[PDB]
Design a protein around this ligand. Structure first.
Ligand SMILES: [Zn+2]
Lengths: 85, 771, 113, 180, 424, 107
């Protein structure tokens, strides 16, 4: 479905400093994988936000749950060096 | 007893093995807090933790509670024991990983051996055992009045003197590349514990794949050689799409030696059954299992089982194809709804799953078809056409010498496509729900000179068709000469590797009709009728598209023969890459006796050149090898007789793609390219066909018939002097009716031979025709 | 040379050294497969010459010992298979290799000298 | 860890009649009914309940607790390792533990309850068993106080044994259930 | 210096009185087969004569019932229970019970074993008290009875120098890579792995790399191996692909003496008869069949299986077969299976001709009377062992398919050590 | 190896929308929650995570592209790098939405 246009596809194509000539549908695959990654991190970060369900923010996720879901999991170990601010 | 333990610690454990030495010498010592919270302290549990943190990455030194098991080396000279710790995981890792990370801790790049008796400190373990034997042996003995009992250790002065009567992405990319170099080393150390760290949470992207997987019609068998072997890439087909899954396949050898091999090897599965395979071998009174390590065959050397006499050679199941015959072509995981998601994520363990189903109606479908076919010749043709069912554009990579112009502008191709399309439009309207070639074609050539960049253009066009559909398509590769040479260019897709075309025919450069009228467009309309032929040939034989099926029809016979051998359990399968014997010792002198020099079928000379009467031959016997097994090792021959008796039953009143199995079963015995049996089967069927030739050379002699020739295709009959040629019809039916009875099965037809007053010396005389 | 099989009409039949296509349909197969079959027949006869037994004039019994030079019998010492039989087969292999092209077959004939 | 991991087996012995609930996602071969009798005074009968998901495992375990109506809940080293792991796995899945069986922890981290009064038997080994410290685990207390040597396997190869040989791990979990 | 082939040397006619080299000069005789079995027993006869006590044949031990002599003989099988033993006088027969042999060796049908027991004079059924085959010897005694004649031609006694040992200890940049256990050139994985190994062997030049020849996967038989290609044309395509892959590395092309040796899967010349082991002394596949890989280099030498290479002080026979699968197949009744028969057996393939044929022409190519102090046993059923407790260094390059892939060895001939290297 | 530490140089590294991040957090788990809001520090972490993941997939596709000696990239080079980072769960639905994008981009 035409939901994510070529504007953000060209936004995520000029961002790379040293990149080889990729195809026009591989960047579309990376954009579809990026929205599924953001959906997987949202669904897997409420698995660790349910560990602290004593208050009203149990259905609402936050940075402490995001930080521990990034440092515990092995498929999200590339994000703890970029969560530091 | 301290001398026995000092002898086992003095000779560095040379009589002991390496696993008992690393379980004996090492020290289990876990931690309580993290590595970062132990700054400023120096101990052996902090040194092993720092070595695991810079050797196996930073992922295990994040959380607290690390179990740092260690050993102590000798090669750091005059250093403390708190900084001489080495983990046990450096000896379980690979050779250049341990050699790369050992020397940075050992501080010696001069070492060439990785033998554990040379690295570890025998003197630190000797002094810790010495202070324990010093206390409990030499400490209360000198005061009691007896001497030093152990002469290896000694006692000092205090008890001896009494005896006097964009920026930052470069750093991030190098950090992620070294981080994933340690994660692949973590998976190189063990292949299952890190794998279930992503599948511990059942997300809704694994559950959707688990709710959309039922009746997996498998399509192509594959390989994985750059990593763990024994795991197969399976392109199974779901109800609406095709899923690329992976299958874990074990190696079920028949060995019977698992009795006293329990502390020797690591026997996990405990199963004792009838693991006796009956093949002809050398020891007398022996007249005719599985594995827990699917990556390496660490088998036992010394054979003494005390159950039956005879060394088991390790007769195996076929390692690359033990799922297409033992399982099915239509795979089905019979279980609940929620375990198959873990099977999709890890890889399907088909040893405990993947049972068969009904094998009829394998492929009822509707999807796209890719079609790559190459045409090399002695002239430079190279017609690398790429037909696709959705794009309709074929791309020929032709015209290697670019000076002259000899290739058409698709005008002639379009006119012959129109005439061929009208005749095959009726033939295409028969098979149109599978392949739609019904639209009017339109295409463009690519006239190329180089070969390397032509393969680069070919790889760009196959990635173009693999990106235009992704999946839900089928690529039928059909190159004749370079069929196994086209497997280096493009891969990782489902492909019937088939030599359909024999060779491209030679042609003078003044026309192009034998290379374009029936070679290019007739092959894509034949590809439509050919995939319906393939649907029927894989619905009957029940094997996926891994077979040749037109050049070599010896694989379907092999899959059916392996299923017939798996129906029973006395006789088993054989070799896969060898010349395929069925003997007791594959690497021996047994096959020179079964070579059989010049292989004489028959050679008759009764010296009759001029025949006495006007006799006509109608004795043109075919299928004599088929009509030998249907009349007649022993169990392999009777299971072949039962398979051919069941095979002739479907080749009567209802047959479309199973009548070729009979003629391919005739051709299948004499060649080594055929699988699961050609060893003693060829010589035995040759002697039994020689016996059947000698039985049918005199049982048909109800009249005065004599022979002069016998070479399994035709013989000589002889009729009376009266009634020369008008009586052919009744003589032919009476000859067939008296020839069908003494052979007792009568499955060899005789049609239209020739004879009219012959002359025959031995081979150079053919005088006579009467048709 | 025995049992040549065709590619697709499956007519299994023997051929001769005195005349390549089928006798059922009509198409040439290749020349290198017939060339390969002739080196296979040559090596088969050479390995069958290599497994010759202890046989002579009086002692016409089977050979049952390797370490034994000759039988404790009264016959003159000779052999089982003669070299003149395989050199007559080697010159008919050379005649069928030089009558036709057959480069690797004559190459292996030169290799065994 | 209690959030990156999941429980594979629950081996419980309700008054002589043992039970076992296994997670079919990690465990490959589904375990059938077997026996573990290391001595004739300790009979072990274990009807395995092969639940597919971990939510099914935890709900069948809490359903069997809610139907059997226990008056004593025992385990070895409960409040330190065994009991908060099940509270974190019941906090991860939608059904929280306190809403069905009343097992809320105290201020010091001890999983007490109102009706059943949880019996952590590692608070007897550390208190007055007169056992030497360094050999106070479950294997050494059953080799010393009880008269049999149980199944001695290292816990670091427990996870590859879930996918490879689950019958030996079901024997080990039934061993520590009849020993507890 | 140069590679001594299977037929490119003088013929060593070992006499029973002096064991020297006589002048023989295209097809063998039966007299040479009788001399072959006589040289198989008479050259192991001096393994206890020059070691030492009383030596006498079975003719002095026929009519009795109690004995003392260690009966040296090769094990046979005539009938179902007719275990025959010999010497060049007659024959002895061995029973099947009271078996207690030395468990530091391997017994097989054809290894010469000393035995002791009773005679059992009703018939001739010798018994087994002690079953131990004799061992070999060292360098100082193996070449003193040979006189002053050569192996390849250096016929002078100039090899008693320690400057020849300092000539082999001087250039320490010598490299003898063994490379490993018969690679298959059909799958792309072994091709990419040999490309990476040639990259790491291209940036640093060796001196004489013992490569791995005859590398087709399927053996050549009397049928077309590929789809439309034959079994001769598919291997032509495979050595042309190996020649184009070898010409992508231009450092091995000049100084590295690449040596090609077959296995049991040789080309169209020597392996279309057999499919399992064939004759062990083979002929090398020459320039007549292979043409494309010979023009890409100037240091490619083709040689057979039991072929020594000269270093003027050292001989290295690089054998290739499944010896650990053949010795395991014949018992009495990975590491410790071939470390027990180098000294104990002076023949490279101790079997009869009915179980392993040897050509009657060449039998002094696989004999081990000049004992090598460095030896290569390339197998496919063994491990990477290196045991030197005798003086002979025996290395075994294992395989390519195990848990970690791409195993290959690197034997330094100057430092006399060996190492192995994986790459993934 | 180590070259330099981290750099908060977010002048050009602050580009992705915020409405798409909160649009990609629907998540209905069959009536187990209300799903009212997400705080802004988690939305800034999700924006930086999406940008870092797109750079992650591009370096992993280019690092497995050089092993096959191809100087290009593709769908069979991007999705053959998704198992190297441990994300096969993303690989299956990216295949069905890529085939829905290819089945709807023709019209
Ligand atoms: Zn034909």
């Amino acid at each position: 479905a035409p939901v994510f246009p070529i504007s953000k596809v060209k936004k995520i194509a000029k961002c790379d400093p040293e990149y080889v000539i990729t195809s026009n549908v591989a960047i579309s695959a990376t954009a579809f994988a990026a929205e599924l990654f953001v959906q997987n991190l949202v669904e897997e970060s409420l698995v660790l936000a349910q560990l602290n369900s004593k208050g009203k923010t149990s259905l609402r996720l936050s940075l402490n749950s995001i930080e521990e879901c990034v440092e515990k999991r092995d498929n999200f170990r590339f994000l703890e060096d970029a969560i530091k601010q | 007893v301290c001398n026995r333990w000092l002898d086992v610690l003095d000779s560095h454990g040379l009589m002991l093995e390496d696993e008992d030495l690393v379980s004996l010498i090492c020290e289990n010592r876990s931690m309580s807090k993290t590595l970062k919270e132990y700054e400023g302290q120096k101990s052996t549990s902090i040194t092993t933790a720092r070595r695991l943190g810079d050797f196996l990455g930073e992922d295990m030194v994040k959380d607290k509670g690390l179990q740092c098991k260690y050993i102590i080396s000798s090669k750091p000279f005059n250093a403390p024991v708190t900084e001489r710790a080495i983990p046990v995981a450096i000896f379980s890792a690979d050779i250049p990983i341990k050699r790369s990370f050992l020397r940075r801790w050992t501080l010696d790049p001069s070492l060439e051996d990785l033998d554990i008796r040379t690295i570890i400190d025998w003197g630190y373990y000797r002094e810790r055992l010495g202070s324990a034997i010093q206390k409990i042996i030499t400490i209360p003995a000198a005061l009691q009045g007896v001497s030093n009992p152990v002469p290896r250790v000694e006692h000092p002065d205090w008890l001896k003197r009494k005896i006097a009567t964009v920026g930052w992405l470069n750093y991030q990319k190098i950090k992620w590349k070294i981080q994933a170099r340690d994660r692949k080393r973590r998976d190189q150390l063990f292949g299952n514990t890190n794998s279930s760290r992503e599948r511990s949470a059942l997300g809704s992207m694994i559950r959707k794949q688990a709710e959309s997987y039922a009746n997996s019609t498998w399509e192509v068998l594959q390989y994985k050689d750059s990593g763990e072997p024994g795991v197969l890439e399976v392109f199974v087909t779901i109800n609406g799409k095709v899923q690329n899954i992976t299958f874990h396949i074990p190696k079920t050898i028949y060995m019977k030696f698992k009795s006293q091999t329990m502390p020797l090897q690591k026997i996990k599965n405990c199963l004792i059954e009838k693991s006796s395979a009956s093949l002809p071998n050398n020891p007398k009174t022996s007249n005719p299992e599985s594995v827990f390590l699917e990556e390496k065959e660490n088998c036992t050397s010394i054979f003494n089982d005390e159950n039956v006499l005879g060394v088991f050679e390790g007769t195996i199941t076929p390692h690359q194809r033990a799922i297409m015959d033992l399982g099915a072509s239509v795979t089905f995981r019979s279980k609940a709804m929620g375990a198959l998601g873990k099977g999709i994520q890890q890889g399907f363990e088909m040893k405990d799953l993947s049972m068969a189903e009904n094998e009829r109606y394998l492929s009822g479908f509707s999807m796209d078809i890719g079609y790559l076919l190459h045409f090399p010749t002695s002239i430079g043709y190279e017609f690398f056409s790429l037909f696709k069912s959705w794009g309709d554009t074929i791309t020929i990579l032709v015209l290697k010498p670019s000076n002259q112009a000899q290739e058409i502008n698709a005008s002639s191709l379009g006119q012959i496509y129109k005439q061929m399309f009208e005749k095959k439009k009726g033939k295409i309207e028969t098979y149109s729900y599978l392949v739609d070639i019904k639209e009017d074609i339109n295409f463009e050539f690519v006239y190329f000179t180089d070969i390397s960049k032509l393969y680069r253009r070919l790889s760009q066009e196959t990635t173009k068709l693999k990106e235009e559909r992704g999946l839900q398509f089928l690529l039928l590769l059909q190159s004749p000469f370079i069929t196994k040479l086209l497997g280096t260019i493009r891969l990782l897709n489902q492909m019937p590797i088939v030599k359909l075309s024999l060779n491209e025919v030679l042609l003078p450069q003044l026309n192009w009709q034998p290379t374009l009228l029936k070679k290019l467009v007739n092959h894509v309309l034949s590809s439509g009728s050919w995939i319906s032929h393939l649907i029927k040939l894989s619905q009957y034989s029940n094997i996926p598209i891994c077979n040749l099926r037109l050049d070599s029809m010896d694989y379907i016979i092999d899959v059916l023969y392996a299923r017939k051998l798996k129906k029973e359990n006395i006789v088993l399968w054989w070799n896969e890459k060898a010349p395929l014997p069925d003997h007791g010792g594959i690497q021996n002198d047994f096959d020179l006796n079964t070579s059989w020099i010049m292989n004489d079928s028959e050679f008759p000379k009764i010296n009759n050149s001029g025949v006495y009467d006007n006799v006509v031959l109608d004795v043109g016997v075919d299928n004599l090898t088929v009509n030998t097994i249907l009349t007649s090792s022993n169990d392999a021959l009777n299971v072949l007789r039962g398979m051919l008796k069941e095979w002739w039953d479907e080749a009567l009143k209802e047959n479309s793609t199973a009548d070729l199995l009979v003629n391919s079963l005739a051709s299948w015995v004499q060649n080594p390219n055929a699988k699961l049996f050609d060893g003693l089967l060829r010589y035995h069927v040759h002697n039994l066909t020689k016996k059947a030739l000698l039985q049918l050379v005199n049982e048909f002699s109800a009249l005065g018939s004599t022979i002069v020739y016998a070479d399994r295709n035709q013989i000589l009959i002889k009729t009376n002097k009266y009634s020369p040629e008008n009586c052919y019809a009744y003589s032919q039916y009476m000859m067939k009716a008296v020839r069908t009875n003494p052979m007792f099965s009568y499955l060899d037809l005789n049609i239209k031979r020739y004879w009219d007053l012959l002359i025959w010396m031995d081979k150079f005389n053919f005088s006579g025709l009467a048709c | 040379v025995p049992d040549f099989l065709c590619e697709y009409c499956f007519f299994i039949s023997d051929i001769d050294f005195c005349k390549f296509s089928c006798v059922r349909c009509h198409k040439a197969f290749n020349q290198v497969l017939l060339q390969e079959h002739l080196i296979q027949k040559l090596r088969s006869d050479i390995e069958s010459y290599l497994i010759q037994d202890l046989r002579c004039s009086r002692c016409h019994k089977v050979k049952r010992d390797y370490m034994s030079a000759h039988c404790p019998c009264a016959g003159a010492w000779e052999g089982t298979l003669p070299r003149e039989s395989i050199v007559q087969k080697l010159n008919v292999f050379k005649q069928v290799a030089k009558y036709y092209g057959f480069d690797i077959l004559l190459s292996c004939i030169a290799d065994l000298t | 860890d209690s959030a990156v991991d999941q429980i594979m087996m629950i081996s419980y012995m309700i008054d002589g009649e043992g039970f076992l609930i296994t997670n079919r996602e990690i465990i490959s071969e589904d375990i059938e009914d077997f026996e573990y009798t290391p001595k004739p005074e300790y009979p072990g009968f274990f009807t395995i309940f092969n639940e597919n998901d971990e939510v099914a495992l935890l709900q069948r375990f809490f359903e069997h607790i809610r139907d059997v109506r226990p008056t004593v809940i025992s385990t070895f080293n409960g409040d330190f390792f065994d009991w908060p792991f099940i509270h974190n796995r019941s906090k991860i899945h939608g059904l929280d533990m306190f809403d069905e069986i009343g097992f809320a922890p105290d201020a010091e981290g001890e999983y007490k309850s109102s009706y059943c009064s949880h019996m952590d038997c590692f608070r007897w080994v550390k208190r007055d068993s007169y056992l030497p410290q360094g050999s106070q685990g479950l294997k050494a207390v059953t080799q010393s106080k009880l008269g049999y040597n149980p199944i001695e396997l290292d816990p670091e190869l427990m996870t590859p044994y879930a996918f490879e040989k689950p019958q030996h791990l079901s024997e080990y979990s039934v061993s520590d259930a009849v020993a507890t | 210096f140069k590679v001594i082939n299977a037929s490119q040397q003088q013929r060593f006619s070992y006499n029973p009185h002096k064991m020297q080299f006589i002048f023989v000069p295209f097809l063998p005789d039966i007299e040479d087969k009788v001399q072959m079995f006589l040289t198989r027993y008479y050259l192991t006869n001096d393994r206890v004569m020059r070691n030492e006590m009383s030596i006498t044949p079975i003719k002095n031990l026929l009519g009795r019932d109690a004995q003392n002599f260690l009966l040296l003989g090769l094990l046979n099988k005539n009938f179902k229970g007719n275990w025959s033993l010999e010497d060049p006088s007659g024959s002895v027969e061995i029973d099947i019970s009271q078996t207690i042999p030395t468990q530091g060796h391997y017994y097989v049908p054809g290894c010469m074993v000393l035995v002791e027991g009773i005679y059992y004079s009703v018939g001739n059924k010798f018994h087994v008290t002690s079953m131990t085959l004799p061992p070999g010897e060292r360098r100082e005694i193996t070449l003193e009875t040979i006189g002053n004649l050569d192996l390849l031609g250096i016929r002078l006694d100039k090899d008693l120098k320690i400057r020849l040992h300092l000539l082999e200890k001087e250039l320490t940049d010598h490299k003898f890579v063994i490379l490993g256990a018969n690679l298959f050139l059909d799958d792309l994985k072994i091709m990419t792995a040999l490309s990476k190994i040639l990259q790491k062997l291209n940036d640093d030049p060796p001196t004489l790399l013992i490569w791995q020849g005859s590398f087709t996967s399927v053996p050549v038989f009397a049928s077309m191996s590929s789809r439309n290609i034959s079994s001769s044309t598919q291997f032509k395509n495979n050595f042309d692909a190996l020649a184009t892959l070898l010409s992508r590395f231009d450092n091995l092309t000049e100084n590295t003496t690449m040596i090609f040796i077959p296995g049991p899967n040789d080309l169209w010349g020597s392996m279309v008869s057999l499919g399992a082991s064939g004759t062990l002394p083979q002929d090398p596949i020459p320039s007549a069949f292979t043409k494309k890989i010979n023009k890409v280099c100037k240091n490619v030498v083709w040689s057979s299986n039991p072929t020594r290479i000269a270093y003027l002080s050292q001989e290295i026979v690089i054998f290739r077969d499944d010896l650990s699968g053949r010795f395991k197949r014949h018992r009495l009744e990975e590491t410790r299976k071939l470390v027990k028969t180098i000294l104990d057996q002076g023949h490279l393939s101790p079997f009869l001709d009915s179980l392993r044929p040897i050509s009657w022409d060449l039998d002094h190519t696989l004999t081990l009377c000049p004992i090598p102090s460095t030896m290569v046993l390339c197998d496919t059923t063994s491990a990477q062992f290196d045991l030197t407790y005798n003086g002979c260094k025996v290395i075994n390059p294992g395989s390519f398919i195990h848990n970690r892939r791409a195993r290959y060895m690197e034997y330094v001939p100057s430092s006399k050590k060996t190492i192995q290297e994986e790459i993934y | 190896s180590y070259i330099k530490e981290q750099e908060n140089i977010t002048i050009q590294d602050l580009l992705f929308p915020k409405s798409t991040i909160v649009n990609l957090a629907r998540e209905v788990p069959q009536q187990s929650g209300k799903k009212l809001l997400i705080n802004k520090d988690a939305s800034l972490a999700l924006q930086r995570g999406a940008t870092v993941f797109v750079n992650h997939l591009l370096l992993f596709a280019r690092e497995i592209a050089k092993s096959q000696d191809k100087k290009s990239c593709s769908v069979d080079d991007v999705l053959s790098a998704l198992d190297h980072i441990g994300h096969s769960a993303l690989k299956g639905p990216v295949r069905d939405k890529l085939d829905e994008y290819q089945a709807a981009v023709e019209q």
